[PDB]
């Protein structure tokens, strides 16, 4: 064989080049920095009304409005300050697995096992929330819808590929292929130039929204990756797999920056998010709880202890004032 | 605060509609249709009347939502937990493919799929309604092809009844939570229109069993 040998040697020499020039690990430089102690957060608000498993949530761009998707086919927009239900949207498919809040607040795109990303318009003249458009073209379940602007959105799927859409036309503008497993998460860069998607093939990939080319590939996990998010500066990203290991990779170093695992945790990570400063990486775990890791010292500097079921989703506001967590016990809790 | 006082009222109305929707949704039966593809689940779907296909039907004032996920073509480990809470799992197995092969024959495919589903961690308190398709074709085929081709340890006459009973028992032995969950076997009929009645009886028994487990006498 020729292609197999060529691919093997390319991988071998690129890995050798990456390892040989690596200077030192993250801890070797960040050891001298004092820790943060214990991040003690208390439930300021508890949002009730979902009557099934909560699978996703997304913060509004104003750090006050929230959208949450539940397994009973309900999409609820909450007022986070006063726990008022701003909107209630009946989904056509009850098997919703992800969804997001538009950066302008006018739209919400949401979907799941129905192979469709349904997009709903909030600021209508009719006083309700109408379905703006159904984006179809995926042959596997849908994950991590994320609006770029009012008319452009990227979605990952179980088709081993991601898709950049055009909501005005409804056609798949760009297709990103190359994964060898179910792509379970994606996260948009802050500057709307790149994004990263983690798949069930235990790898993440950095893709360009305008060129559609495989810019980077990132390995290091042993099982499927469930969640991914960008560092706020757009030069790093954190993944969480079923291995129960959270890993921080650098987009430019091409090597994992740090591991965020501990011996006591056996169940994998369900959701991952950062604080505004990029100092507190929050990770919602499979057992019952959420861990607040010090994203520089890899120490559990705080635990959110509620959520009598599996914590499915996390979210941090743009200003960082609060953190909303959704779990499988049908309860959204806001921590500050 | 007048605007806030109206917003609280709007949220209260929204919450009461949510409560009503939950009350309505808790009063319906959820079935997860599973099979090996060549097991003729389409026949079951027809007798009841891409991605996930929902079939809604009413029988004896009981509402049934049956979810077919045969057109997913993805790793079940990522979305099977979404069905934790279904009333029952309707499994379909063909009896004609005991000799036909897909390497390995399709009957072992169906048996190991059944073993995987029945012993799933998300499926411990959920019952399985097992359907055996191609009754006439299986009866006619064994007159020339012995069941020994599939099961080498089988010892019995190549008749429909003994072979079918052996196959049912072999499927039964795959269960490991013999006291937690229960397996409900049926042989599919064409013109009798009894499959829906069997599903109704099975789901009724499941509901009664859950009520008894709740009460504390049982």
């Amino acid at each position: 064989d020729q292609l197999r040998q060529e691919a093997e040697q390319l991988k071998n020499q690129i890995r050798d080049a990456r390892k040989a020039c690596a200077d030192a690990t993250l801890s070797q430089i960040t050891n001298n920095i004092d820790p943060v102690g214990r991040i003690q957060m208390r439930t300021r608000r508890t949002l009730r009304g979902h009557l099934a498993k909560i699978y996703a949530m997304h913060w509004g761009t104003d750090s006050r409005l929230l959208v949450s998707a539940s397994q009973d086919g309900k999409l609820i927009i909450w007022d986070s300050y006063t726990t008022n239900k701003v909107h209630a949207i009946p989904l056509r498919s009850s098997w919703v697995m992800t969804c997001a809040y538009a950066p302008s607040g006018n739209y919400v795109a949401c979907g799941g096992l129905d192979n469709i990303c349904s997009i709903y318009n909030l600021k209508t003249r009719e006083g309700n929330v109408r379905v703006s458009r159904e984006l179809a073209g995926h042959t596997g379940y849908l994950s991590c819808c994320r609006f770029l602007d009012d008319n452009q959105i990227v979605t990952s799927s179980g088709d081993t590929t991601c898709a950049l859409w055009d909501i005005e036309t409804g056609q798949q503008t760009t297709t990103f292929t190359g994964h060898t497993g179910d792509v379970m998460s994606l996260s948009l860069a802050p500057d709307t130039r790149l994004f990263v998607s983690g798949a069930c093939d235990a790898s993440a990939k950095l893709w360009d929204v305008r060129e559609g080319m495989c810019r980077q590939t990132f390995t290091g996990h042993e099982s499927d990756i469930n969640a991914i998010c960008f560092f706020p500066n757009g030069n790093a990203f954190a993944t969480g797999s079923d291995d129960a290991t959270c890993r921080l990779f650098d987009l430019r170093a091409d090597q994992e920056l740090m591991t965020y695992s501990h011996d006591n945790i056996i169940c994998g990570i369900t959701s991952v998010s950062f604080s505004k400063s990029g100092r507190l990486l929050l990770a919602g775990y499979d057992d019952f709880n959420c861990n607040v890791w010090d994203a520089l010292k890899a120490d559990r500097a705080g635990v959110l202890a509620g959520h009598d079921n599996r914590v499915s989703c996390l979210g941090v506001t743009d200003d960082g004032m609060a953190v909303a967590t959704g779990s499988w016990d049908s309860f959204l809790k806001i921590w500050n | 605060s007048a605007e806030d006082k109206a917003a609280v009222e709007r949220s209260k109305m929204i919450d009461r509609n949510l409560r009503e929707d939950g009350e309505k949704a808790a009063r319906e039966v959820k079935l997860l249709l599973l099979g090996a593809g060549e097991s003729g689940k389409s026949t079951i779907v027809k007798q009841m009347k891409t991605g996930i296909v929902e079939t809604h039907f009413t029988f004896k004032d009981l509402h049934f939502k049956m979810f077919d996920v045969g057109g997913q073509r993805s790793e079940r480990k990522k979305w099977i937990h979404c069905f934790e809470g279904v009333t029952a799992i309707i499994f379909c197995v063909a009896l004609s493919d005991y000799d036909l092969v897909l390497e390995m024959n399709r009957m072992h495919e169906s048996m190991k799929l059944f073993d995987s589903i029945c012993n799933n961690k998300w499926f411990t308190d959920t019952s399985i309604i097992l359907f055996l398709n191609k009754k006439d074709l299986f009866e006619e085929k064994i007159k020339k092809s012995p069941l020994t081709i599939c099961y080498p340890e089988y010892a019995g006459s190549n008749t429909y009844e003994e072979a079918a009973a052996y196959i049912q028992c072999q499927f039964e032995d795959l269960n490991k939570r013999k006291d937690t969950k229960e397996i409900y076997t049926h042989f599919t009929c064409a013109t009798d229109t009894k499959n829906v009645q069997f599903v109704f009886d099975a789901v009724t028994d499941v509901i009664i069993k859950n009520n008894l487990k709740d009460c504390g006498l049982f």
Epitope: N84 | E3, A6, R10, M13
Partner: single-chain antibody, 232 residues
Framework: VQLVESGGGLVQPGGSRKLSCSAS????????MHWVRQAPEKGLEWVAY????????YYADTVKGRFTISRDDPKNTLFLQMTSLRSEDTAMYYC??????????????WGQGTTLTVSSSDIVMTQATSSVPVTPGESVSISCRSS???????????LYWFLQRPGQSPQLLIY???NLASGVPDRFSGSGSGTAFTLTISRLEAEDVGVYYC?????????FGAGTKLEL
């Protein structure tokens, strides 16, 4: 969206009438509804309010207990049943929608109104003048003052700026301080502090003439300003 009123006409004192407001073009069941009135060449004056689901009902203290508010959600019809009519009830009545959640504009759409002729504590909002002449292309600033500080503890100041062109219905321009309504050109702006409030108009065109009104919500009853008429 189309709200159409009916029931107007001429009535004798001591009688009872009924005003109907038919909605067509939006979700009437999800909108609270206000009845407002405007006396001939005098100014606007709020009448009544009914929340979504007919839960909360508010009447103006001057007429409280003498009018009645009814709602038909399966039919999308608003009823104002008026029991006894003096010589002051003669006016043009408007049927306004109002939806209340975080960020909504609760005075967006107004009805066309219906006329009624009868034969013969509360916050005070005062507007500076009643007639200001100006030419197109010149920025105009209108001001009005309140008694209480409308700035609530929420941080929101419940001030509303409306415009009524000659022969037309009122149209919302500002709903808290500087939040432009839907379909209003970006030349208008609003500002102020606590009690003193200013509406500024840059690059004024010929269609911007009419009577401007400043209103406060903040509490019931809702009180309107005098109404400053721009002249050209």
């Amino acid at each position: 969206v189309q709200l159409v009123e009916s029931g107007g006409g001429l009535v004798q004192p001591g009688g009872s009438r009924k005003l109907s407001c038919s909605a067509s073009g939006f979700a009437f069941s999800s909108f609270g509804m206000h009845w407002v009135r405007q006396a001939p060449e005098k100014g606007l004056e709020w009448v009544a309010y009914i929340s979504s689901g007919s839960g909360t009902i508010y009447y103006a203290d001057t007429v409280k207990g003498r009018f009645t508010i009814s709602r038909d959600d399966p039919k999308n019809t608003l009823f104002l049943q008026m029991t006894s009519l003096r010589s002051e009830d003669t006016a043009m009545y408007y049927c306004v929608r109002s939806i209340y959640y975080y960020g909504s504009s609760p005075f967006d759409f107004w009805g066309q109104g219906t006329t009624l002729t009868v034969s013969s504590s509360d916050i005070v909002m005062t507007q500076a003048t009643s007639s200001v002449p100006v030419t197109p292309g010149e920025s105009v600033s209108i001001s009005c003052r309140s008694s209480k500080s409308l700035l609530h503890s929420n941080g929101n100041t419940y001030l509303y700026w409306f415009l009524q062109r000659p022969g037309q219905s009122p149209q919302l321009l500002i709903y808290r301080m500087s939040n432009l309504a839907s379909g209003v050109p970006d030349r208008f702006s609003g500002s102020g502090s606590g009690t003193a409030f200013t509406l500024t108009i840059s690059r004024l065109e010929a269609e911007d003439v009419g009577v401007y009104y400043c209103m406060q919500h903040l509490e019931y009853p809702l009180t309107f300003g005098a109404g400053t008429k721009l002249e050209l």
